[PDB]
Design a protein around this ligand. Structure first.
Ligand code: FAD
Ligand code: FAD
Lengths: 445, 444
């Protein structure tokens, strides 16, 4: 049995780990080949100065930027099989910088010894299902040797992400704007916008955080405009909210009310698309970003072809723990431990899940929904169970601290749901901690 | 019937369509034509976009053209032999028109030809496979309008997807730490973003000098050109320094191979491009550095391992539009059985001879004269209007001289059309002062 894993981000790392964990217990695991286009694993977490296209002409993958910290409480991502105490030995504050979180992430994955399965600097060019042999043709470009080769596989797990191919809407006047226009995906360094007025369009994943990085690092003025429901956050004195953008000229933005302001740069925080150029329509997932995409049994299995799998393709309220559950589930399906219903029943099961999804209004409902999804997957495998209700509860006190004050939510502390450890206060308040580094974070004063 | 896939509708793809249309106008039986273009409109590089990185559909942005771009060489060197500047603009214009004017020109030709009807816009080529059992090509494509992936069968394929879009972007020590903007020439859009800033231009590829000129003209505080290559020869303005290669950067500063250090606000990597065809496997895929004579191409056009596959405009460009034409006419007549191909071994041999001659090229004059001879060879074989290549070369000579005189005024010079003999009038505004790059201001 021969399996292909597209991508060495957290999802592909989870899949590898799922298989190593089955084997470490004593089962005989299929051969694993994980193709990764970057020079090293980590996916989104592997930060790069590069933007647009990479050294090989491949789309730059990572959207992460300098000075980024944990989006939510670290206790909400803490791995179900590997604790923050286990890895660091010391208690730490609740919103670690990217570097810190990365060290934690690789700590688990290298203790697992799964690196041996990965082909780096190798981009999946095509995946094709052979009707006659019930096998897959995966065509790959190796950028080290510069050769395009293909090899056959029995199962394929797609772990290539959905936060890398930008949705970039055009607004009337864009060709003439004398300032810089970039998608959030291209944002690297908040110092570039020091003393400048930045217009921030949209309300997708990084809109609120990108703004607050610019603010913290000395932007002159921020303007947020968006089309979704206004979160009543108290913004700082030089942060302005306007109705949606309609047009721009050489140096000005014009909003729906009829007001205008001088704008030095425009960051489109307008989201991403599910994009799989290596896929034909018989295998290609088409969906907007949501809690419940169609055509995926248990949110993981490609319904038109049970031999193909997708990890991490849902909108991510939960992240790392969800990828694990999804991976473990997919592993047990591939290995023959869990038999799949018929296409008809899979489709109908997914419909019940969609119908549930359409019902959700509040943030609490949305976590509970995703928590229940993960609980469902965990129940079917030997994945260790974790305190989902209390994790939901923690997510919700994070949303609460955001509402109280959007600029200081990162100085709050939370109780670990793996070890019960209350996180200590960080030595430096967020606003003042300009230093991005692990070495800064781990030390004192 | 016979059907042909044309990949890309830049100058080259437009030209191929024009080649077939002209044969039909002369009364020939034309194969069925299908042209795939990932952008919304034709023009290739010349279709300007504000976008960088990835386009509205998640496809890599193709154009590397920036605001305020004017023709690098005299327009007299790129005039179509069958579609004249006089015919198009109805009147004499200066010799270095801005982008939109040249964009207006090139589409003016194919609008008249009525070839828009063969083109499928907003459609990205995903894969091309040759089928041995069928002697035919499967072209898999993504229509971003319908959001569907399909595949059609073709007897011949002509690849016109360009080779100046996928950048080569080297790392220098400290790039992760650098506090300012780092971009490739490919991403460069508007010189204004650099008003009052110190800009480092790394390398000496095609656009190094011109990007620096834009920044200078639109008010950059200081420019620094650094490169490993031999000195360019140009005396720059007062606020522009040359340096040997970059070595490393810190938070604010760049460090050079001569022990020098300078604070820089932005680094522009002018390091060129790679030939990149993610839709081809090793059997069909041209692999080469940018040069006057790539290998594996008979007459610079015919893929030798599969003579049913063709490439237009894949060589480095002294000539541009005339060349794509000669190439498009040549590939037309091969497709239409008008020019049978010699053996594979014989094809490799003609290629070697053109390669060995290329290795002997030792001056700029020799290089464009070489390309001129290559074009003359292609044109001798077809009904493409012959035009005075030797006189075109002398126009290149005159242009290189003008650059050597004063690099900031070379665009203020006029030249005689080798097609109509029209003498380009002096433009109403010197380049340094013509801040407005529009077609309306230009033709006023
Ligand atoms: C700005 C930003 C901040 C975030 N912050 C947090 C946070 O604080 N906490 C949190 O829990 N989550 C955060 N996330 C969510 C993030 O999506 C997940 O943490 C996680 O990275 C998802 O992992 P993934 O493997 O599914 O996708 P990715 O991490 O994106 O990895 C996909 C991998 O597939 C590879 N790949 C793609 N195409 C190909 C190809 N054709 N061939 C070969 N390889 C390919 C890529 O190189 C990449 O390594 C953030 C996301 C963004 C964009
Ligand atoms: C910055 C810059 C400045 C230049 N200035 C001049 C100048 O002043 N004078 C001059 O004579 N020449 C200039 N050139 C040279 C230029 O290469 C030619 O003028 C000309 O544009 C080449 O035409 P082409 O059709 O061969 O390639 P392109 O113009 O690049 O067109 C290729 C086409 O293929 C399409 N395409 C690519 N891949 C796919 C795919 N996968 N699926 C569907 N479609 C695809 C693209 O969208 C594009 O339309 C310049 C080039 C650059 C980069």
């Amino acid at each position: 049995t021969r399996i292909a894993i597209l991508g060495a981000g957290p999802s592909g790392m989870a899949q590898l780990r799922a298989f190593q964990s089955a084997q470490e217990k004593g089962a005989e695991i299929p051969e694993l080949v994980c193709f990764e286009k970057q020079a090293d694993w980590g996916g989104q977490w592997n930060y790069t100065w590069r933007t647009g296209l990479d050294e090989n002409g491949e789309p730059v993958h990572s959207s992460m930027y300098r000075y980024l910290w944990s989006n939510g409480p670290k206790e909400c991502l803490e791995f179900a099989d590997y604790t923050f105490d286990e890895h660091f030995g010391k208690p730490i504050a609740s919103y670690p910088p990217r570097e810190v979180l990365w060290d934690y992430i690789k700590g688990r994955v290298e203790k697992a010894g799964v690196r041996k399965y990965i082909r780096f600097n190798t981009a999946v060019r095509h995946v094709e299902f052979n009707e006659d042999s019930q096998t897959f043709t995966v065509t790959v470009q190796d950028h080290t040797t510069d050769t395009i080769y293909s090899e056959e596989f029995d199962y394929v797990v797609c772990c290539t992400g959905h936060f890398s191919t930008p949705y970039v809407p055009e607004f009337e006047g864009f060709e003439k704007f004398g300032g810089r226009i970039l998608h959030a995906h291209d944002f690297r360094d908040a110092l570039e916008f020091k003393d400048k007025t930045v217009l921030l369009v949209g309300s997708s994943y990084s809109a609120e955080d990108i703004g607050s990085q610019c603010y913290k690092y000395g932007a002159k003025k921020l303007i947020s405009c968006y089309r979704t429901a206004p979160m009543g956050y108290k913004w700082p004195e030089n942060w302005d909210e306007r109705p949606n953008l309609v047009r721009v000229d050489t140096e000005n933005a014009y909003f729906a009310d009829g007001s205008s302001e001088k704008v030095d740069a425009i960051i489109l925080c307008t989201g991403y698309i599910h994009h799989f150029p290596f896929l034909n329509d018989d295998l290609r997932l088409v969906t907007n970003n949501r809690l419940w995409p169609l055509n995926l049994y248990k949110g993981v299995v490609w319904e038109d072809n049970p031999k193909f799998f997708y990890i991490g393709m849902q909108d991510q309220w939960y992240s790392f723990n969800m990828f694990d559950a999804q991976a473990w589930y997919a592993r047990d399906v591939i290995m023959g431990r869990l038999p799949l219903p018929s296409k008809e029943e899979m489709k109908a099961d997914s419909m019940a899940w969609r119908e549930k999804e359409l019902t959700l209004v509040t943030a609490e409902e949305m976590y509970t929904y995703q928590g229940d999804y993960i609980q469902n997957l965990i129940d079917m495998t030997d994945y260790p169970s974790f305190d989902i209700p209390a994790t939901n509860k923690t997510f919700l006190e994070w949303k609460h601290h955001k509402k109280e004050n959007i600029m200081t939510f990162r100085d709050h502390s939370y109780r670990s749901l793996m070890t019960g450890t209350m996180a200590p206060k960080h030595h430096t308040p967020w606003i003042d901690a300009l230093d991005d580094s692990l070495e800064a974070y781990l030390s004192d004063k």
